[PDB]
Amino acid sequence: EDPPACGSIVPRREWRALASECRERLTRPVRYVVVSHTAGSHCDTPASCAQQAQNVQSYHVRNLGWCDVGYNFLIGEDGLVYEGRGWNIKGAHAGPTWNPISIGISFMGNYMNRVPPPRALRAAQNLLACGVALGALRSNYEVKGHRDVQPTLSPGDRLYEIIQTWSHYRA
Amino acid sequence: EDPPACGSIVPRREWRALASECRERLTRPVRYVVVSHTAGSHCDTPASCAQQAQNVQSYHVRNLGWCDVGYNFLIGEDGLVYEGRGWNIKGAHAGPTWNPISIGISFMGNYMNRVPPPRALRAAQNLLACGVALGALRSNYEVKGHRDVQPTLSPGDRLYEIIQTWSHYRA
Amino acid sequence: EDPPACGSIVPRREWRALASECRERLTRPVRYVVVSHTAGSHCDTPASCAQQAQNVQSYHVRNLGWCDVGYNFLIGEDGLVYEGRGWNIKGAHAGPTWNPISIGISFMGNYMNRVPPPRALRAAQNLLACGVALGALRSNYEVKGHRDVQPTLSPGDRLYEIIQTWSHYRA
Amino acid sequence: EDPPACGSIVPRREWRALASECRERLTRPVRYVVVSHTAGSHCDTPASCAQQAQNVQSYHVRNLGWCDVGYNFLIGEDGLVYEGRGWNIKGAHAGPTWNPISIGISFMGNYMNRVPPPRALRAAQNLLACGVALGALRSNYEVKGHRDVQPTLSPGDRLYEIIQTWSHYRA
Numbered sequence: 001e002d003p004p005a006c007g008s009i010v011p012r013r014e015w016r017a018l019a020s021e022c023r024e025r026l027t028r029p030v031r032y033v034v035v036s037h038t039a040g041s042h043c044d045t046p047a048s049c050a051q052q053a054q055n056v057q058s059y060h061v062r063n064l065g066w067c068d069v070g071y072n073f074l075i076g077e078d079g080l081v082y083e084g085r086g087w088n089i090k091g092a093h094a095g096p097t098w099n100p101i102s103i104g105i106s107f108m109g110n111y112m113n114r115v116p117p118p119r120a121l122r123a124a125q126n127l128l129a130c131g132v133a134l135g136a137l138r139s140n141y142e143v144k145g146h147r148d149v150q151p152t153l154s155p156g157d158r159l160y161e162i163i164q165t166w167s168h169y170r171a
Numbered sequence: 172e173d174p175p176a177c178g179s180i181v182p183r184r185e186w187r188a189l190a191s192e193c194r195e196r197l198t199r200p201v202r203y204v205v206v207s208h209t210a211g212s213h214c215d216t217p218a219s220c221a222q223q224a225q226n227v228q229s230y231h232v233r234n235l236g237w238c239d240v241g242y243n244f245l246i247g248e249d250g251l252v253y254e255g256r257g258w259n260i261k262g263a264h265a266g267p268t269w270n271p272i273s274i275g276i277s278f279m280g281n282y283m284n285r286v287p288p289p290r291a292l293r294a295a296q297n298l299l300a301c302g303v304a305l306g307a308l309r310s311n312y313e314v315k316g317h318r319d320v321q322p323t324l325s326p327g328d329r330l331y332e333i334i335q336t337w338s339h340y341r342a
Numbered sequence: 343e344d345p346p347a348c349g350s351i352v353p354r355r356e357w358r359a360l361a362s363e364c365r366e367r368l369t370r371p372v373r374y375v376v377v378s379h380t381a382g383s384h385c386d387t388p389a390s391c392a393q394q395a396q397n398v399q400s401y402h403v404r405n406l407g408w409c410d411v412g413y414n415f416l417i418g419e420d421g422l423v424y425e426g427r428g429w430n431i432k433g434a435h436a437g438p439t440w441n442p443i444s445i446g447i448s449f450m451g452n453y454m455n456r457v458p459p460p461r462a463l464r465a466a467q468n469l470l471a472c473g474v475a476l477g478a479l480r481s482n483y484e485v486k487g488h489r490d491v492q493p494t495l496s497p498g499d500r501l502y503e504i505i506q507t508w509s510h511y512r513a
Numbered sequence: 514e515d516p517p518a519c520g521s522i523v524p525r526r527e528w529r530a531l532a533s534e535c536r537e538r539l540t541r542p543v544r545y546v547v548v549s550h551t552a553g554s555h556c557d558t559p560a561s562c563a564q565q566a567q568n569v570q571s572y573h574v575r576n577l578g579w580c581d582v583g584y585n586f587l588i589g590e591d592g593l594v595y596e597g598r599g600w601n602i603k604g605a606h607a608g609p610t611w612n613p614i615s616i617g618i619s620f621m622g623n624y625m626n627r628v629p630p631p632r633a634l635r636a637a638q639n640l641l642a643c644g645v646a647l648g649a650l651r652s653n654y655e656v657k658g659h660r661d662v663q664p665t666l667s668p669g670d671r672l673y674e675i676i677q678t679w680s681h682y683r684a
């Protein structure tokens with residue numbers, strides 16, 4: 001009865017993230033998950049994927065002036081999960097309505113016309129099962145695509161198509 | 172007391188807009204303009220363009236349950252401006268820091284891989300001068316790309332590449 | 343839609359209400375909730391709170407000439423919701439812009455220098471969730487104070503501070 | 514930190530409850546609901562019903578030596594529900610055959626020559642649906658009276674006839 005029976009996650013340190021200055025918290029257990037895509041280039045090795053997480057945060061903090069990278073977690077095609085703001089901190093990925101009540105996970109890449117590789121799909125689903133196991137998400141949490149709550153094409157046609165079949169998907 | 176022009180704006184009732192539920196006001200003169208794209212299909216006839224203004228508002232209100240189409244104005248490839256929420260109503264186009272202090276205009280189409288036709292651009296430039304002439308915009312207003320204030324590809328590489336050249340543009 | 347309903351509400355007859363003469367319907371689902379106070383005497387027991395309901399309806403019907411008590415629901419410090427005009431009928435609580443597009447709930451008493459007990463707040467928020475569940479309110483409904491849409495102290499300095507913190511609150 | 518639980522439950526600490534020491538968990542969702550009376554005093558205000566819940570729980574804890582008040586929830590004549598051991602903790606209210614399979618709720622007074630007011634019955638029905646809504650209760654649950662499962666005069670003569678008229682009430 002391991003108190004934390006879930007998940008390999010690449011932590012901030014390891015992907016060389018800038019220290020976060022977000023303080024605003026979510027309230028566990030969290031009800032909604034919104035799946036996005038970064039919409040840039042993908043990345044398929046740990047060194048490449050850790051670079052990409054760095055660039056993303058670089059955009060949100062350097063350019064856009066945010067307190068941290070927007071997403072709670074990002075999903076690489078190396079098939080690891082990168083800690084974004086994580087389970088406890090409100091992200092900025094889906095507007096002032098969905099942000100304080102969800103967890104935004106973003107796949108790194110562009111899935112308009114490309115599907116994530118199986119290992120990235122498993123990483124993402126294992127990550128959700130682990131949120132439930134941890135009490136961070138509700139046992140009956142709901143998955144939305146980004147496009148379901150914000151006017152956008154994110155998470156891309158081929159990914160949208162996939163998340164829709166998921167156990168917890170609810171539009 | 173001088174008012175001139177200046178709308179060749181196509182008014183909501185003409186493009187068969189559903190009636191807006193929004194009540195929140197911008198305060199004039201408005202300092203900022205944010206230029207997005209719909210990421211959508213483009214339209215080059217006053218008939219398709221009216222029909223697209225519908226489909227775009229239909230997305231925001233029916234799908235997303237918003238009070239109205241998120242943009243203050245939209246821009247067809249027909250060379251006409253489409254009235255959205257207009258000059259005095261807060262729009263929902265660039266998040267909660269920029270929505271209340273800006274006008275958002277969006278070009279109907281996806282401009283990652285096309286430039287909008289020059290008449291589309293003349294329409295947008297003439298809008299903005301109208302706004303100044305009305306006292307809706309500050310004479311020295313500033314223009315931003317959507318991707319400059321929010322994480323997105325909007326308004327498209329090509330379109331973005333154009334707006335960087337505008338006199339009122341600002342880093 | 344559904345056999346019986348959600349949440350508990352003291353019915354019109356139970357608080358000895360005069361029959362309604364109102365017929366203007368609201369349009370489901372409603373986007374706005376406006377929270378007032380009555381600035382009248384407060385009460386903390388089902389007996390005294392029913393009495394108070396009556397006195398308010400009475401002032402509205404007999405002195406103001408309204409078809410019924412202006413509020414859709416009233417709220418007692420006894421922790422009970424009193425049925426006003428209900429989910430379906432247009433109230434008179436927020437003036438002619440807001441009355442046709444909102445549900446008006448009023449806490450019975452004056453909340454400038456005191457707060458309503460946790461039980462009143464709970465009942466209020468409860469009511470509201472039931473509104474959504476019935477499909478009388480939008481799921482993305484927005485709460486406003488009376489002072490946000492009309493110039494008035496209502497709902498009273500201390501209660502306004504409170505509703506500011508509600509999830510659905512948009513000034 | 515979000516909107517309160519459905520049901521408008523007066524939380525433990527609001528009725529000045531001694532802390533629970535119970536830890537046997539009920540496995541959701543529960544099939545049976547058992548209705549009892551307390552046979553103690555009865556109370557018609559929030560003040561007097563807080564106190565009465567105190568007194569019942571005191572009797573259970575200090576005198577009988579139980580981990581907490583025996584009932585999952587108590588119901589006041591003030592029209593409120595008082596959180597006992599709640600949705601997730603096995604109670605002690607109907608003996609060892611009935612406690613591990615059910616949620617016990619009890620009305621606070623003697624219902625032999627009296628009935629609880631309509632508000633008290635409203636609270637309870639409301640509690641039970643909020644049960645389902647949470648996922649604590651079977652969508653398709655069965656309600657049983659105390660005298661049906663254990664030799665007793667509980668829930669009184671009058672209360673007991675009433676609940677037999679409830680829909681969910683089983684033979």
Ligand SMILES: CCCCCCCCCCCC(=O)O
Nearest residue numbers: 471475517518519645646647
């Ligand atoms: C999910 C069934 C109906 C939900 C209606 C809203 C009442 C709240 C129940 C959800 C539980 C919670 O918010 O903790």
